[PDB]
Amino acid sequence: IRHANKATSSDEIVQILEEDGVVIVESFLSSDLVQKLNDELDPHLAALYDYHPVTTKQMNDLPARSQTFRQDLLNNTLIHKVCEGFYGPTVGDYWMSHGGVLERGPGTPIQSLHRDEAVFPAIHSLSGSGPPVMLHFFIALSDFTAENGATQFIPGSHKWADFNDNGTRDQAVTAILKAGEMVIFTGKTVHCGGANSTKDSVRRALGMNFHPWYVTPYENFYNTPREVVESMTPLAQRMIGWRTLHPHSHSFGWWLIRNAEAGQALGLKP
């Protein structure tokens, strides 16, 4: 995997992503931003069910839960330029399907090599000729060691003609990052989580999985309190399904209410 950032352009980042299926952007979040995210997130990780430590933890509905995710992450300029470059001419519009914080503690087993877009057999059966669907931004909230199980990737596996082949493990490259760095990959790229050999270290990450406008998001954000939705930018509101999408094909719009803009239809400002 290419650990390329700092002087790298977003067009370049899109190019490494399309050639390899995975890219590492160094120092994406400021260390203060990482500390702000962990501070806002810790109480809700502790409250997940209101001598048996819980090794594995998964949490979503981040916009309701974190202000910095509400504002900083959903409006991040690099994530949006990479989304526009990844979806390209034919797609047009996109939104976030899943935003989740992931925690593996000590003793977590090794994961199977897999492709996330396997959840869509109708898309997954086209293998590498298939349209771009899933785009995954995997952000740091703890150190990524091979020892604590940093996620592994097989570069170029997004282009294979047969997706029944998940490859073999010696083809996987571990993604080592330290601070609020990110790794981007497509839903067609083979990957797997690592085993956490240390007895003393918990792996924490934030994944943001985006979809094209025409693929159903995994998360429903309509129970998000109205006051917090009104505090968000219209771009972030479209990302969480509160605004209509604008595909280039049928530019009149999609996800409408009475053939009119959706967010205005249920009380948001125009």
CA distance 100 to 206: 6
54 belongs to the binding site for its own copies (CB under 8 A): yes
Give the Cα separation of 95 and 237 in Å (integer). Answer: 9
The answer to the question of residue 47 lying near its own copies (CB under 8 A) is yes
Our finding on whether 72 is near its own copies (CB under 8 A) is no
Residue choice 9, 53, 77, 270 for contact with its own copies (CB under 8 A) = 53
Q: Residue 74 — φ and ψ, nearest 5°? A: -70, -20
Per-residue binding letters, 171-210, with its own copies (x by CB under 8 A): ----------------------------xx----------
Look at strands 56-59 and 191-192 and give their pairing.
unpaired
Q: Does 116 bind Fe ion (CB under 5 A)?
A: yes
Phi, psi of 72 (to 5 degrees): -75, -50
Residue with Cβ nearer its own copies (210 or 213): 213
Does residue number 103 form part of the binding site for Fe ion (CB under 5 A)? no
Residue span binding its own copies (CB under 8 A) among the ranges 8-16, 22-30, 76-84, 215-223: 215-223
Binding part of the chain for Fe ion, among 10-18, 39-47, 109-117, 259-267 by CB under 5 A, reads: 109-117
d(CA 174, CA 41): 26
Rounded CA separation 130/241 (Å): 25
Q: Which is nearer to Fe ion, 67 or 111 (CB)?
A: 111
Query: Is residue 255 a contact residue for its own copies (CB under 8 A)?
Result: yes
Q: Which of residues 87-116 bind its own copies (CB under 8 A)?
A: 89-91, 98, 100, 102-103, 109, 111-112, 114, 116
* CA dist., res. 206 & res. 200, Å (int): 20
Cβ contacts of residue 177 below 8 Å, gap of 6+?
A: 3, 24, 26, 140, 143, 144, 150, 183
Which residue ranges make up the site for Fe ion (CB under 5 A)?
116
